[PDB]
Amino acid sequence: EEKEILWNEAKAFIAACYQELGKAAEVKDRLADIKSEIDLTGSYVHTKEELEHGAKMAWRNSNRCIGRLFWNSLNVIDRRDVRTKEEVRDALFHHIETATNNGKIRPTITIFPPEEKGEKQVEIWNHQLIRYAGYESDGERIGDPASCSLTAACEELGWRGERTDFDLLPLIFRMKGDEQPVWYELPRSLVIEVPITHPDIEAFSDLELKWYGVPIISDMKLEVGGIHYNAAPFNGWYMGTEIGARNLADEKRYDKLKKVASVIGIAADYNTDLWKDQALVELNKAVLHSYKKQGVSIVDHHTAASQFKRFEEQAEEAGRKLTGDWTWLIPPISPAATHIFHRSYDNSIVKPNYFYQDKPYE
Amino acid sequence: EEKEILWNEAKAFIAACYQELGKAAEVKDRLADIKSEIDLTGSYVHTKEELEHGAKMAWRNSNRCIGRLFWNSLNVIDRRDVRTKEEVRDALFHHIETATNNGKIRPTITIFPPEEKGEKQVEIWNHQLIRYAGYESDGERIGDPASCSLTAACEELGWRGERTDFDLLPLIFRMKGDEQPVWYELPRSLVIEVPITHPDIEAFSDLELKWYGVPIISDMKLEVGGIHYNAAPFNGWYMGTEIGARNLADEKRYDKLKKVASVIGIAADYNTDLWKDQALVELNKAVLHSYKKQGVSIVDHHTAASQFKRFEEQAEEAGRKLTGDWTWLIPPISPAATHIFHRSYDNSIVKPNYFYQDKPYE
Ligand code: HEM
Ligand code: HEM
Ligand SMILES: Cc1cc(N)nc(CCc2cncc(CCN(C)C)c2)c1
Ligand SMILES: Cc1cc(N)nc(CCc2cncc(CCN(C)C)c2)c1
Ligand SMILES: C[C@H](O)[C@H](O)[C@H]1CNc2nc(N)[nH]c(=O)c2N1
Ligand SMILES: C[C@H](O)[C@H](O)[C@H]1CNc2nc(N)[nH]c(=O)c2N1
Ligand SMILES: [Cl-]
Ligand SMILES: [Cl-]
């Protein structure tokens, strides 16, 4: 039953992967070995080339990602060899360091051993490798509300946050065979953060806003040819709106628009004044300015959309169907100023791809 | 075949309409009369009450409309009695006058005789009753590009535009039996226009922008209980973004963002400066300010979304399913600052409703 599904996924993947790599003549033999490996073992093992191209295809197929033009330059780190929590920890520290690259961010994925019988070898609890803690208790909100449930799980395991608005959560993951996950404080030297200032408005620094340099999603599953890599953290560089229009702006996140309005010297009393819109534009300008001043890679939503248009053009040129989720591709500010807003996209799921999975906390 | 479809639509509509009106006991008899009327005539005729409530239901069911909270206060004008082009013209002039209401806009629909054998009695060519002409010839763009095809059709019929950027198109419609439509110049006294100025930036008036007061969609079909009212123009008041973020901003419309950037004194050289976003916010502030100064009804997108939230709440309270098109309901600026962005909607089509129809030009 499962080896039927596996074998079928393998045939589809290997065929497509080898076509793209100019190695179609090797398919039959490779497929032969896989058939035997599955029969004899219940699974199969990707070559380094297959794993690398698979991760790249999965990014290429990610409907919700505007940044896909650069899919083929993804840096794939093969860590299927890790067996200990120390090795996992050091691999995660290494990912942070190499992806950060002193600010010139390298899109990277680190791939850990895949599920066996659907049994995870390693299970990463963090949503992103770098993220801020959040607390809520008796009227008091501190930090990132989105992190409240994971923060509480961490404090159940003996970690204690300082309760600033920007506590770095520890790395937290569980090894096969262990009942509880382990946690490790992030070395501050590894984590680039960017204080938010505004190019023109000197008072903006009074808000004492900052954000971290590199978004590293660590809780999605990479599926490649029937093999389930549930632990495979990946990163790009930020699009500014992610920070300025969502992380710092949403009422259910840092909720800073009223405070932004005050420091930029506009009233926040009347909807018709469009003060939220003005505050959003200034906050987003500040975010882009700040990352660039500090030499940390970032892209604005106009440039990103222009790049995505090139991705569309390349898909058609290569004779590949384009898939996308319009609702996620449009930027959260000035969406109609982008070409994305004015066309539609097929939201079909194509594999290899990255998928959500259930949180082991909650 | 057709009388089957008609009768079935009639049963569903009359049943629902009379439930809502507290007249469920009258359904059986009314349904009896309709059954006979269809058999004997091939069609049936709505009571004034049915027609009025039907138009209101159609608005309530319009998935792409954020303004639906006020569905039950729609002003329905029954003009099923018109037979001549003079009467149609005067009914259209009347709609403009009564809906405008000296600036305190009244949501209104005027309903003309419905299709018979699918044969239209009157066919309105205008997309909106008030709209600006557009011209393109040998490098030269003037006016509203969206109106180019209708403008060209009008000039085929002996009309000539002055070729300003804001020529009012004439009313243009065709009567049953006539090969060509007729056209009538709009009396300027009927048409309120609003010059666009900015509350703070005096130079904004140098752009010489203006827009008309009342959006009156005149080319959609109202379907009520199997009866097809192909000529039934309707209006609300504007949401500011329609004018400021789309009509005046789109590259394929008036394309004013670069000129806005210049008058507000910011550079339009770098994507990372978010100059388009800033220009959009200032243009949208100017639009709202200008309509309010002139005493013409308008709503900003924040207030409109708050009203739409109340519409959602009322639907659930009344035990009615809510339908909506997320892609049209989100405003084109700061969409994530509205609740709409953060939930989903069922885009199912429910009747009565308003529908697109093929343009007789093009
Ligand atoms: C190189 C720079 C990149 C940029 C600028 C970029 C941009 C974005 C943005 C703006 C989002 C929406 C995030 C949100 O609203 O939560 C997104 C989602 C996504 N990106 Fe990218 N991305 C990049 C690289 C990558 C890479 C390297 C991968 C994988 C190898 C990836 C896979 C995805 C996936 C799977 C999502 C959806 C995540 C979810 O559903 O929560 N992206 N991207
Ligand atoms: C009272 C004030 C109203 C406001 C503020 C409002 C708001 C809006 C907005 C912003 C749109 C999107 C238009 C576009 O992007 O092209 C829209 C679409 C629509 N509205 Fe409303 N509306 C109002 C009244 C009405 C009325 C009275 C009706 C009908 C009786 C109506 C039916 C519709 C329909 C059918 C659409 C979709 C049109 C299309 O597909 O092009 N609305 N509305
Ligand atoms: C790889 C990558 C690049 C990039 N520019 N951005 C992200 C995602 C940032 C991000 C990751 N995960 C969750 C949220 C908020 C998620 N909500 C929907 C739960 C944001 C990922
Ligand atoms: C009734 C009503 C109220 C309101 N506030 N707005 C509109 C629509 C304005 C409008 C009407 N028709 C076409 C466009 C642009 C349409 N493109 C998609 C073709 C805009 C209609
Ligand atoms: C292709 C895409 O659906 C298209 O740009 C839509 C998006 N949402 C919209 N929403 C509104 N209100 N009006 C529009 O014209 C559009 N255009
Ligand atoms: C319900 C709705 O789909 C939801 O708000 C989505 C909309 N589009 C989005 N787009 C991005 N990029 N990120 C998000 O978190 C969301 N949220
Ligand atoms: Cl993020
Ligand atoms: Cl309009």
Binding-site members of B for heme are 65
Contacts of A199 (CB under 8 A, 6+ apart): A285, A286, A289
- Which ligand is in closest contact with the Cα of A217? 3
For tokens 């500011």, the residue is B240
Q: What is the rounded CA–CA span in Å between residue B10 and residue B30?
A: 10
Q: Which of B140, B255, B162 is nearest to B151 (CA)?
A: B162
Contacts of A303 (CB under 8 A, 6+ apart): B271, B272
- B354 within 8 A of B234, measured Cβ to Cβ: yes
Q: Is B68 a catalytic residue?
A: yes
CA atoms within 13 A on the CB side of B107: 15
Q: Where in chain B is the domain with CATH 3.90.440.10?
A: 81-106+121-192+356-360
Residue type at position B343? R
The conformation of residue B336, written as its DSSP 8-state character, comes to: G
Q: In what order do the strands lie in the sheet with B122-124?
A: B122-124, B171-175, B182-184
The conformation of residue B317, written as its DSSP 8-state character, comes to: H
CA torsion A104-A106-A107-A113 (nearest 10°) is -140
- A271 within 8 A of B334, measured Cβ to Cβ: no
Task: Return the residue of B nearest to A242 by Cα.
Answer: B336
Q: What is the rounded CA–CA span in Å between residue B180 and residue B189?
A: 28
Q: State whether residue B194 is helix, strand or coil.
A: strand
- Contact between chains at A277 and B326 (C-beta distance less than 8 A): no
Region class of B269: left (phi > 0), else alpha (psi between -120 and 50), else beta: alpha
| Distance from the Cα of residue B139 to its chain's centroid | 31
Residue type at position A347? N
- A38 within 8 A of A7, measured Cβ to Cβ: yes
Residue A122: CB atoms within 10 A of its CB come to 24
Atom 15 in ligand 2: residue holding the nearest Cα? B242
Instruction: Tell me, letter by letter, the H, E, C secondary structure of chain A.
Output: CHHHHHHHHHHHHHHHHHHHCCCHHHHHHHHHHHHHHHHHHCCCCCCHHHHHHHHHHHHHCCCCCCCHHHHHHCEEEECCCCCCHHHHHHHHHHHHHHHHHHHCCCCEEEECCCCCCCCCCEEECCCECCCECEEEECCEEEECHHHHHHHHHHHHCCCCCCCCCCCECCEEEEECCCCCCEEECCCHHHCCEEECCCCCCHHHHHHCCEEECCCEECCCEEEECCEEECCCCEECCEEHHHHHHHHCCCCCCCCCHHHHHHHCCCCCCCHHHCHHHHHHHHHHHHHHHHHHHCCCCEECHHHHHHHHHHHHHHHHHCCCCCCCCHHHHCCCCCHHHCHHHHCCCCCCCCCCEEECCCCCCC
In terms of CATH, what superfamily is B193-215+238-303? Nitric Oxide Synthase; Chain A, domain 3 (3.90.1230.10)
Atom 11 in ligand 4: residue holding the nearest Cα? B217
- B263 within 8 A of B307, measured Cβ to Cβ: no
Q: Where in chain B is the domain with CATH 3.90.340.10?
A: 1-80+107-117+221-235+305-329
Q: What is the rounded CA–CA span in Å between residue B225 and residue B222?
A: 10
Q: Is A68 a catalytic residue?
A: yes
Contacts of A177 (CB under 8 A, 6+ apart): none
CA angle (A174 as vertex; A172, A178 as ends), nearest 5:
140
Q: Which residues of A84-106 are buried (b: 16+ CB within 10 A; e: fewer)?
A: ebeebbebbbebbeebbeeeebb
For tokens 């697109």, the residue is B356
The conformation of residue B114, written as its DSSP 8-state character, comes to: P
Question: A-chain residues within 8 Å CB-CB of B303?
Answer: 271-272
Beta-carbon contacts below 8 Å between A and B = 90
Q: What is the rounded CA–CA span in Å between residue A212 and residue A192?
A: 6
State the burial class of residue A152 (Cβ atoms within 10 Å of its Cβ: 0-12, 13-18, 19+): middle
Q: What is the biggest distance separating any 2 CA atoms in chain B, rounded to whole angstroms? A: 71
Helices and strands of chain B, counted as H and E runs = 10, 16
Q: Does B195 sit behind a cis peptide bond, omega within 30 degrees of 0 on the bond before it?
A: no
- Contact between chains at A274 and B288 (C-beta distance less than 8 A): yes
Residue A22: CB atoms within 10 A of its CB come to 8
Among A242, A252, A301, A308, which is best to mutate for testing ligand 3, by the most ligand atoms less than 8 A from CB?
A: A242
Q: Is the alpha carbon torsion for A249, A250, A255, A258 positive or negative?
A: positive
Region class of B64: left (phi > 0), else alpha (psi between -120 and 50), else beta: alpha
Separation in Å, CA B287 to CA A240, A250, B196: 28, 26, 6
Q: At what angle do helices A2-20 and A27-41 cross, to 10 degrees?
A: 160
| Distance from the Cα of residue A51 to its chain's centroid | 19
Q: Which of B338, B200, B324, B308 is nearest to A333 (CA)?
A: B338
Q: What is the rounded CA–CA span in Å between residue A54 and residue A350?
A: 12
Q: What is the rounded CA–CA span in Å between residue B51 and residue B217?
A: 19
Q: What is the rounded CA–CA span in Å between residue A218 and residue A128?
A: 5
| Distance from the Cα of residue B159 to its chain's centroid | 24
Q: Cα-atom radius of gyration of chain A, to the nearest Å?
A: 22
Length of chain B, in residues:
362
Separation in Å, CA A257 to CA A194, A207, B278, B334: 19, 11, 16, 12
The encoded tokens of residue A249 equal: 């702006």
State the burial class of residue A198 (Cβ atoms within 10 Å of its Cβ: 0-12, 13-18, 19+): buried
CATH of domain B81-106+121-192+356-360: 3.90.440.10
Q: A237, A247, A264, A272: best mutation site toward chain B, by most B Cβ within 10 Å?
A: A272
Q: Which residues of A291-312 are buried (b: 16+ CB within 10 A; e: fewer)?
A: bbeeebbbbbbbbbbeebeebb
The encoded tokens of residue A267 equal: 């009233």
Q: What is the rounded CA–CA span in Å between residue B53 and residue A281?
A: 43
Q: Where in chain A is the domain with CATH 3.90.1230.10?
A: 193-215+238-303
Residue A361: CB atoms within 10 A of its CB come to 13
Separation in Å, CA A234 to CA A215, A290, B95, B329: 8, 24, 59, 33
Separation in Å, CA A273 to CA B141, B245, B264: 33, 15, 16
- Which method was used? X-ray
| Beta bridge partner(s), residue A211 | A194
Q: Which residues of B197-221 are buried (b: 16+ CB within 10 A; e: fewer)?
A: bbbebeebeebebebbbbbbbbbbb
For tokens 């770095």, the residue is A168
What are the CB-based long-range contacts (under 8 Å, 24+) for A148-157?
A: A149/A359, A149/A361, A149/A362, A150/A125, A150/A126, A150/A359, A150/A361, A152/A361, A153/A125, A153/A361, A154/A183, A157/A181, A157/A183
- Contact between chains at A337 and B280 (C-beta distance less than 8 A): yes
Region class of B22: left (phi > 0), else alpha (psi between -120 and 50), else beta: left
* Binding site membership of A344 for ligand 5 (Cβ less than 6 Å): yes
Q: Which CATH architecture has domain B1-80+107-117+221-235+305-329?
A: Alpha-Beta Complex (3.90)
- Which ligand is in closest contact with the Cα of B65? 2
The conformation of residue B245, written as its DSSP 8-state character, comes to: I
Catalytic residue among A68, A79, A131, A174: A68
Closest ligand 4 atom to B239 CA: 5
Q: Which of A289, A205, A248 is nearest to B273 (CA)?
A: A289
Task: Return the residue of A nearest to B305 by Cα.
Answer: A271
Task: Return the residue of A nearest to B273 by Cα.
Answer: A285
- A296 within 8 A of A287, measured Cβ to Cβ: no
